Amino acid sequence: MVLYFIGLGLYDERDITVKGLEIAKKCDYVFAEFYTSLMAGTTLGRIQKLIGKEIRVLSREDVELNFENIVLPLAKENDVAFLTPGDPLVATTHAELRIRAKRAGVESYVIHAPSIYSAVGITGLHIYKFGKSATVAYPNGNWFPTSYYDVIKENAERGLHTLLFLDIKAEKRMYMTANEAMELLLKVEDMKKGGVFTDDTLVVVLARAGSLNPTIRAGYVKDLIREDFGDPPHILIVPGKLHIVEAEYLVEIAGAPREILRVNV
């Protein structure tokens, strides 16, 4: 009669909360989805071993089309867990699943875990200064999406930072790198000429957040566009005007050039 939405956190199998782990262990059935994002620092086997339960992985279609036929039936007469990378319900499509549960007469509870949305605090950038978020999508065929560029423009002109989630080919475990994202933005700039993203733009790259050794780097595009930030996942941030305290953290912790203390504050 109960469905638990449990977040797995940022990077590896230990990023789940003690609460989520203990509840997961007592559930009769455990499902999981790895299409909204991936857990790059672990494997399904390591997660299974930690929880001590078989993990039934579900595809985007299984969830979007058949959640009520695959998960809810069992949740009706058993305690069921639905694991998701990060924090449950951050992914836009997750919330609606709680309505399906209600419609099926199934109780649902949410067990939170760290999300990249809040983990970016490790960049030294003030969380309240982040504006609207966006996703940099790979251009495909005759389709070249560019809305993420406008998001940066609108946030930056208000002195706000822009968090850019990078595209992922979940089914192929292929992550877009911050380098590729920078190349794409420079390409959109050349097409829109809004003076939003150029070689002189200050950016921040956060790689493998959650890991004990994430890569945190800040600098101008011209210098970071070909830098190696390590293994995925990568997150790209285009900060707005900085508070001196943010700038000093970027210089001391993220290796930003001293120049940002006078150009971007």
Ligand X SMILES: Nc1ncnc2c1ncn2[C@@H]1O[C@H](CSCC[C@H](N)C(=O)O)[C@@H](O)[C@H]1O
Binding residues for ligand X, rule: CB under 6 A, are: 10-11, 36-37, 85-87, 90-92, 115-117, 165-166, 168, 206-210, 233-235
- Bridge-based pairing of strands 174-175 and 79-84 is unpaired
Q: Which of residues 48-107 bind a second copy (CB under 8 A)?
A: 50, 86-96, 98-99, 102
101: which DSSP letter? Answer: H
End-to-end, the C-alpha distance of the chain in Å comes to: 54
The answer to whether residues 104 and 225 touch, using CB atoms and an 8 Å cutoff, is no
The CA angle 145-148-151, to the nearest 5 degrees, is 140
Which residue, 116 or 225, has its beta carbon nearer to a second copy?
116
Whichever of 157 and 171 has its CB closer to ligand X, that residue is: 171
117 binds a second copy (CB under 8 A): yes
Cα–Cα nearest to 257, from 223, 227, 232, 230: 223
Query: Please, are residues 3 and 106 in contact by the beta-carbon 8 Å criterion?
Result: yes
Token digits of residue 107: 């109780």
Nearer to a second copy, 150 or 227 (CB): 150
Q: Which of 94, 217 has the CB closer to a second copy?
A: 94
**How far apart (Å, rounded) are the C-alpha atoms in residues 140 and 143?**
5
90 annotated binding-site participant: yes
The entry of ligand X, a second copy, none near residue 253 (CB within 5 to 8 angstroms by kind) is a second copy
**Amino acid type, 128:** Y
- Residue 115 assigned as binding residue: yes
Residues of this chain that bind a second copy (CB under 8 A): 7, 9-10, 12-19, 21-22, 50, 86-96, 98-99, 102, 109-115, 117-119, 121-122, 124, 126-135, 154, 158, 160, 165, 209-210, 212-213, 245-246, 248-249, 252-253
